[PDB]
Amino acid sequence: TLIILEGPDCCFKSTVAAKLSKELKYPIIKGSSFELAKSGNEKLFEHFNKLADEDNVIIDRFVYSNLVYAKKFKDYSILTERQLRFIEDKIKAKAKVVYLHADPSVIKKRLRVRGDEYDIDSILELYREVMSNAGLHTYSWDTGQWSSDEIAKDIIFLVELEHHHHH
Amino acid sequence: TLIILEGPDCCFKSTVAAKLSKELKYPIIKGSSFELAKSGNEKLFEHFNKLADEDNVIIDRFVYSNLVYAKKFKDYSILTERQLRFIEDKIKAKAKVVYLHADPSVIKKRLRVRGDEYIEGKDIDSILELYREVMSNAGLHTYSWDTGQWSSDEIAKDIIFLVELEHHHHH
């Protein structure tokens, strides 16, 4: 199964991915790449289609993140409706979309390095809209209430069930 | 005089500003605001024009950074050639434009230590290049300092020297 982790920064995405990989033994792959989106739609889509054709992997940031940041950065290709829906229909039977987030203030506090770097409110709103428009069943966790460890365990427990395996 | 600090991130801009302010006793004001940039050109120009009326203050990032970041973010207003030219003429007799930079390697290092992980090499390069180009094309005389070999103390001292030497400069 494809475990897709989406969401704004500082929301335990990489840590979750790490825990899930150590347990499920699924390789971790970065999906939504900046420079990739700037290389054009064709390369963008072909990349997602390559991953979409795979299974038993953990994708840190994927199609939904592209729809978010494409509205923020210039020269940042975005997937067309056709492309998005094409990929969803191809992974619908094997994907698990996990949305990780936190309150705008919780994230802000998490990036205490310089008030200038801080935007976040606008990104969260976009994720919500994008996720709310997803054509796949999704699972969301408020990283502000649940720990990265409890989230990983839930996802691991879940995957083990569908695979009809014990714990 | 009006001190303007420009340049990419982690180049001692805010530190220099704080040191210059302690000495010269000039208030410190951030010029380029991400929120203001997304509120439209009219709002953008209006704000820059008001700052252009100020004097004896330090502007941490101004019209030049606007030109840089407008080419990187969407729904991010940019000054027009005419407006930029208008602001320059308006403060040419009191402005001191400072450009603080550093090699890409140095910048990337400061980002790592600052805590980033997502070191966007290519992005950082394009931004650094934009700054050089926009600064070279500045309609106002500019002073540059390679923060890779010059400390914020040494820089502030140099700038303090220039402000003092001003009542000796003509034309």
Ligand SMILES: Nc1nc2c(ncn2[C@@H]2O[C@H](COP(=O)(O)OP(=O)(O)O)[C@@H](OP(=O)(O)O)[C@H]2O)c(=O)[nH]1
């Ligand atoms: N409070 C808490 N934080 C956790 C937990 N799991 C991971 N984190 C921390 O939160 C930070 C962002 O983790 P990461 O998953 O890379 O964020 P991301 O969603 O942007 O990818 C990390 O901190 P650092 O970069 O500062 O080390 C990681 O250690 C957890 O259960 N609780």
Ligand SMILES: Nc1nc2c(ncn2[C@@H]2O[C@H](COP(=O)(O)OP(=O)(O)O)[C@@H](OP(=O)(O)O)[C@H]2O)c(=O)[nH]1
């Ligand atoms: N090596 C050195 N570093 C200096 C010197 N001056 C300022 N710095 C450091 O470099 C960091 C970025 O400085 P700052 O002026 O905030 O950068 P900016 O231009 O993005 O505003 C700071 O570190 P922190 O945020 O980590 O504290 C500041 O302390 C100096 O002469 N030498």
Ligand SMILES: [Mg+2]
């Ligand atoms: Mg991550």
Ligand SMILES: [Mg+2]
């Ligand atoms: Mg600063």
